[PDB]
Each structure stands twice: as C-alpha cells, then as structure tokens.
Amino acid sequence: MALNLQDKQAIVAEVSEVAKGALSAVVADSRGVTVDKMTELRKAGREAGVYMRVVRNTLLRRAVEGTPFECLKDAFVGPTLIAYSMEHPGAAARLFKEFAKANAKFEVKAAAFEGELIPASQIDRLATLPT
Amino acid sequence: SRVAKAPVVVPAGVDVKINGQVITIKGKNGELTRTLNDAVEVKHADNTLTFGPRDGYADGWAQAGTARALLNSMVIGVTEGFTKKLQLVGVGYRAAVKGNVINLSLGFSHPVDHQLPAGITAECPTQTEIVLKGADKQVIGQVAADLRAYRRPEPYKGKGVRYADEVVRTK
Amino acid sequence: AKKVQAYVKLQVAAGMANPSPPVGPALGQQGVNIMEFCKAFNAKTDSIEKGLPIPVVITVYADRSFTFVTKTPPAAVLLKKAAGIKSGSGKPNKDKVGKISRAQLQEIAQTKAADMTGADIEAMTRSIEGTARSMGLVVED
Amino acid sequence: RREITREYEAVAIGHMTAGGTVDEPISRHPTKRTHMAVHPMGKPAVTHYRIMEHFRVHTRLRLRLETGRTHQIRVHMAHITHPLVGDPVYGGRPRPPKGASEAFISTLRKFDRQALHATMLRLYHPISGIEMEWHAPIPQDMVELIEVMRADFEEHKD
Amino acid sequence: MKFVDEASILVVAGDGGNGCVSFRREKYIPKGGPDGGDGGDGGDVWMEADENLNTLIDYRFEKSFRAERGQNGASRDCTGKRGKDVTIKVPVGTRVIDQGTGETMGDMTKHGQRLLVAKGGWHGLGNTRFKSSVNRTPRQKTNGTPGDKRELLLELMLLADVGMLGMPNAGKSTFIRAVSAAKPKVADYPFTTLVPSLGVVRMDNEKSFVVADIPGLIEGAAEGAGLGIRFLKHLERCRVLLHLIDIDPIDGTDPVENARIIISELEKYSQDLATKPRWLVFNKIDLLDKVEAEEKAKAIAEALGWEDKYYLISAASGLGVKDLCWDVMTFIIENPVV
RNA sequence: CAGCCAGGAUGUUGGCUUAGAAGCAGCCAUCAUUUAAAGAAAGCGUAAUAGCUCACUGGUCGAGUCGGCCUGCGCGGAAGA
C-alpha cells in the first residue's frame, strides 16, 4: 500500500455519497467472475453511467471508520466480505433486488443478500419497491 | 518466532502425554513419540499448547517455531491421515504390493523388493499407480523419496516413477 | 462465457471461402470439421455483407456440430476500407502516417450488435479511437 | 594502382590443407647477395595462394601474385616452410617420400628447374577498353610431373 | 535429437616447441657443454566422422578448438613431447568452407575417414644442435614454426539416398508414417515438419534406402515465407528426387500453376540440382473416388509437361506405397555410384 | 511484508516483417475506459493459439516489514610430499 493521502480521500468521497444515498444491497464475491462483473455493473452503467460505486473495502478499519459518522447501525459489517452498491438517484430503486435475483445466476454466494438498513430492518427478501 | 506465537488446537480423541520433554500424541490413527533439542519445553493448556524458548540460548525462537510445526506434522496425522501419490509411467513398468513389501518390475534383470516400515501401508488402486498411507511426515516422505531413487525420471521422456504433485520438465 | 471449454478464434476475412494459405485446416481439430464453414456460419454473414473479418467462439462440448453465435468484427479491420490507407504501418513512428477525424469511427462504432460496457455512449466514443494511433495516426477530436 | 591480375601455377612440397594470404615485408638477404629473404623491416608485400588438388607429399596449386618483384612468389611460399619442388636456390633440400618408386625419384632429378608457370593473364586494351583473356598450356615437364605424382599417390595411399 | 543447427568454428594448431639454451654445470666443474635439446612438434587437428553425432549443437557451444602446444626444450638435452592431436567428432556428410577465396577441403561419405585440417607448428632447435669448433659457445636457438590458423564454415548436409520434396501440408510427414520407421510430427497445418527427420525403408535383406524430409516453401529468392534456401542445402546428394503434388486440396487452390512454379524455383537454387532424375507422385487420392482421380491425374501431367508414369500414392491410406518403393529400388540398384 | 481463498477481463485475434507471432522472434507512439483492484504486460509450451503465472487488489491471520550506509568479530577464497 502507498501512503495515507488517497486512503483518507477514498473514505471521504464514500462518506459524502452517504448524504445523497438510497437503499443498497450486499454481495460476497469470494469466487467472482469478470463476466458476472459485467452483468450487475453494466446495469449500473445502463441506468446513468459511471457514477455508481461498488468499491469493496469492508476491512475492519476501512469502511467501519465512516460508520460512526453516518449510518451508525451499520457497524455489523465487521464480519466477512460485504460489498456496497450505492444509488444517488431515486429512493429504494430496483437495483436492491437485482443481486437476489442474480444469486442463482452463477453467483452462488452473494452475502445472503442481507441488504442495508434504510428502516433499520433485518435480513429479508424485499420486493415492494417504487417502480 | 511468529510460528510459535500462534496457538495450535488439538482435536478430540487424541491425548497428550508429558514426561518432561518426551511427548506422546497417540490418537485414532497410530502412535508416535518425538523429542526436541533439549532447549524448548512443552506446556499443556485447556485446548492449546505453548512452548517458549529458554534463556541463555542465542537461537531461542529459531527452534521454538520448529517445535509446533513438528507437532503440526503429527497432530493431524493421527487424526486425518497422510497420503502421497506416486506415478509410474513407461512401457514395461510393473508395480504391485504383497504383504508389507513392494515388488517392482522397473526394467532390472531381477525384481526389486523394498521392505516398507511398520507404520506405513501401501495399496494399488490400479496396476500402474500406488498410494502410500502413513502416520508421520518424516518417514512417509523418505519412503516416497526412496521409491523415486530407483527411477528418478529423465528430462527427456519423463519415464520412471514420480510424484503426482510435481511435473517433470521435458527437454 | 462459463468455463474454458477450449475456445479458439481465427480468421483473415469474411469475403473469402476459408482459404488454406492464410489459415489452413486449423479451424478446428478436436471435433470441428471444415465442411460446416459454409452451412451455418454463412447463414447471417452472407445476408448483409462480407467485407470485415469476424472472430468467433467454438462452443463445442460433445456434439459433432456447433452451437456458437457470431459477434462484432474488430475495430481495426475497418481502418483499411473506410478510414484510409490499407498497406499497413510501414514506419511506425518515424513521422505522422495519417489523420483521423472525429467524424470517422463515430457512428459506425455504434453498429456493433452485442458489444457494450455500460450505456455511456461517450465512453466508447473515445474508446473506439483507442485502437487508433497504434500505427502513427493523428486524432482530430 | 594494382589493376592487372596475374595468375601462377606452382608445385610445392608437403600435404597442404587450405589456402590463405601472406603479408610479410621483404628486403635483401643480410649475407648472400643472390637471396631475397623475408625481413621485418623490408618492403611490404601481399600475396594470395589457393589449392586445386593435393598429392602424396607434394601439391598442385593455383595462386595470384600482386607485385611482380624479384622472386616474390618463391619466398612467400617458402616462408610458410613449404618450399617449391625442384627449386635449387630457395626450395629446401631434396626429400623424396617414403616408398617412392625409382621412376618418381628420376622425375625429380629430371625436373631440375623451378616449379613455376603462368597460365592466365588479364589485361585492358590501350585504346579500346575491352578485356582480353588468354591461357597458357601446361608445359610438358609439368604434365609428366603431375602424372607421376598422380600414379604414386593412387598406388601408395590407396 | 529434435533440432538441427549449423555454425562455424575457429580451429588453431599449436606451434612447435620452442628451442632452449642452457649450459650444464656439475657440482665441481663450472664449465660444461651447451646443454639443452629440441622442442616438441605442435599438435595437429584431425577431422573425424561420427555416427552418434547428427548435428553441430556442440559447435555453437564451442566456437574455438585449441590444439596442445608443443613442450619447450629443457636441460639434460631434453626434447618436449609432441602435442596431442585433437580429434573432432563430426556427423557424416559435412562440408567445410573457408574465407579468402576458400573452397571445400573434402567430402565425407563414409564413417572412419579422418581428414587433416590443421598442421601444427614444428619444433625448434636447441644450442646443442649448433655444435661446432669455431663457435664453441652456441647462444643461438631457432624459434618454433607458427601454427596454422583458419576459420571453418561447418555445413551439415544429410546422406539422403532418396530425397523427396512436396507441397506444403501435402502429407510429406504422413508419407513417413508408412512402412518407414521414422515418426515425424504430423498435423494438418501448413509446414507441420520443420526439422529434417530422415527415415529408412528395409523391404528385404541386403537392400535398403534412406529417405529424408524437407518441408515445402513458397516462391522466394530471399529467406521469406519462413522457409527457404537454408533447407534446400540438405539436398544435392539425393540420387533420386521425389515430387509430391496434392489432389483436390481441402482449402488450397487446385494445382495448375503452383505445381509448375515449384519446378521453376528449383532451377535458380544453385544449378537446378544438376538436373537429377525427378519422379512425380501424387497424394490425397482416398478423399475422392479412385476412378475419378485417374483421368484428372494424367491431365496434370501434360498440363505441366510431365511424360512419366505419374504414380498415384495414398500416404495415409497406405495403398500403393509399396508399388512406388518397388519401382524406385530397382532404379537405385541398376545405377550404382560411379 | 510474506502466506491461504479468488479476480485476472476487457475495444481486442494491435499494425507492418508477417506461412504461422495474438504479452511472451523483430518498433513503440507506450495508448484508457470500462467496474475498478490489474500492464496492447516481466516468465513456462508450442506457431499463435487454448492454459499455468506475476506486479496489483479483495477477505482472513495480526505486529513489525523493506535495503542502502559506517564499523567490531567471523565464513569461502587457502592443494605437497
């Protein structure tokens, strides 16, 4: 790893996205494929383009640092690999259920699609979203 | 150094005997006893082993790390079992096991009979292959090494006996 | 797109009839024949035009025949017939070989059937030109 | 300018192996006034030699000489301790081969002159500018000299 | 034994043992005769053929060969030993070329021939040989003669009694998959075989011939088309030449002009190969009907001006391979080398 | 830092010399945009193909790691009747 300039900036940019975020989902790509990477992220570029962030930095001292500042209840990401998919436009878009629908599409492990905490809920299969 | 720091967990059904320095880790897959270099002692805890060095010795952590790995070679052996695969390739090569010895038609004028040690057994699922099962790393590695000493493969065709893990280079 | 499945691709052009001196019988030797190059391969290629080489996957597992689908032609094979010279690089960077305008490779790059990485049209607008200036070309975007 | 090319035919002693070039300065012999021996501080000289066929202890060879100084070809062939056959002044002492026939020994006695001959000369015409080429037939003494050596080589070695 | 390479080496012959000057001095008398002897003759280099070696791989490894230098003269009228003659193991059929209007030294055709390449220098003379009354104290010695130096271009060229040349991917290696015991790599792609893997055919006792493999090439004077003159060099001692022409190539053009240009480029190689008797044979006949490939087989003959038997040979199918061998073997026996 | 479990893809078979070279025979202007953590790329096996890999990143382990400078004492260099 290089020095600490970009590490602070990367987290700060992620924190600034939380203020303009929406409902997000999770995925655990321990055994991922670039072809599958061009499926759930090509949809992200399909909607608007490059603005979507799927940065995977769930280390105990990388993404947990921004938890006390925003979404304090999200401190339970300390366990194993968890990914984020943050949406700036729209409230509770259909991208949340995309990972659950793509779980069986050669994506056997998807972090059990535990999702995020917009209402401070638990692991559930949510399909009633504004369309 | 760092190897000795990491704790080691022992499975169930295996006992640890302490008589000073000599240790017995008899389990469900045989029995064996090994000794250290009279510089690192052994201590028994609830579910882990701590060894530590002793003062006055320059090496210290150097041989302490070997201790756990030496145990690591014989804590899973009495629990899981050790299997090494040897491949025999070539026309006219014959391999079989009878009793506790192995007869090899490796192209000699007389068959080669190698006596296996007591704690290691052999079996041939197919005629051209053999599997070696033992209880400790130190002996099973040499027995496989001794077998390859007869037919150390040449770098031209790969003919002879070789491990399945390694790939013989051809030139 | 699932496993290795022993996929190969080789061609020199679409207007030919599988010539030997360029490629030969190397179009498949693990269960792929040579007489099927004009039965199903020339089912959609012959419908539109034969002027651009087309690489394509094998996709053969246990059948004598094939079950693959053709894809888009390369971005640089078009540089010979609709962009300018066709002799080749010659001098790589001793001087400026040719000139490329923003009009060129702008609307033709959108003709790809199934080749896309996101809906950002601007993304591959300058990426189709990414293949350019590999021979001594000049961009005029 | 060294434009005219000159060719020579010579017979030497020894089983030769391959051709080459010799570049050795030459001046007068310090003691004998009829010898022109190789000297390190002599007049620079260049000579080339090739081989056409070998013999028992002799050879037939073709070579080109650049500078036509006095006895240049003999010493440069003798500076490699391979003297000419029958040369009384620069060639070595007589050394008949092992198992030589009486006729062969007589031929060396009969061939009591120097083994040298010029065959091909190339010149440029004075007022025309067109090359002329001429050839010289092998002299009768050389014809029998190579004949007796050919018979001896094909009888002893074979 | 899977690659053939050619290179050049530098051979140097040891100069003769230099003379010595000395004067014996006994434990009591301080004046003694001019003690000392001659030198040692320089070691020569001998060019010897070998069956086991078939390439010049070690010669790229070692570009310099040093003969043993003759020992210097010593006291007590001692003469140094002659330098040992270094013998170089070479595959049979080699040709060696020099510089400075250089030419060949001698062709090797059979094993056991030892060729003299480098003559070592010859020993000098000590002070004792200059014994005389008026001098009575010889301080003169003769330097040893310098060794002979030359640069050899080692050209390896096979003992191919039967040489064959054919179209690319026409089955030249497949033709060796016949009764011939050699096993060249065979595959459908053009220029499948690059290394010349010569084979031998033994129909019966006392009668056998060797067949070499040379890949096809495209019309290029230079080293273009990947292959070229560097492979044509292995020819020129093939008492019979075999020409292979494909019938109905699966993807190539049918032979109507390409089978003619290959004849033309043989003329310009060095000498049209001395216009050796070339036999034209065909291939790829099992793909089509046997009777269909009969009329079209002869049509090519007058198309190319060929008036021979135009043998039809199936290399992969194995039909007719024996018939061609019988015809060529009788031709070989009736025309011995003379 | 090194390990273990995975990513190594893309416009893309990069243009001439090219039969065949398409990261691994010959030239680099060394392209950059896609999700980002990864190069028209240092090594096997051939002719590429197809596959093994690496720098890099993600997860786990959890506390030192990296190589330059000066110096004391050491090792090989050091075989004879």
Ligand SMILES: Nc1nc2c(ncn2[C@@H]2O[C@H](COP(=O)(O)OP(=O)(O)O)[C@@H](O)[C@H]2O)c(=O)[nH]1
């Ligand atoms: N059916 C058939 N195939 C042949 C015959 N001769 C050669 N082939 C095929 O031709 C292919 C290529 O031959 P190749 O060794 O490359 O010849 P080359 O081009 O001269 O080097 C081989 O794979 C053979 O299967 C034949 O007589 N019949």
Ligand SMILES: [Mg+2]
């Ligand atoms: Mg062939």
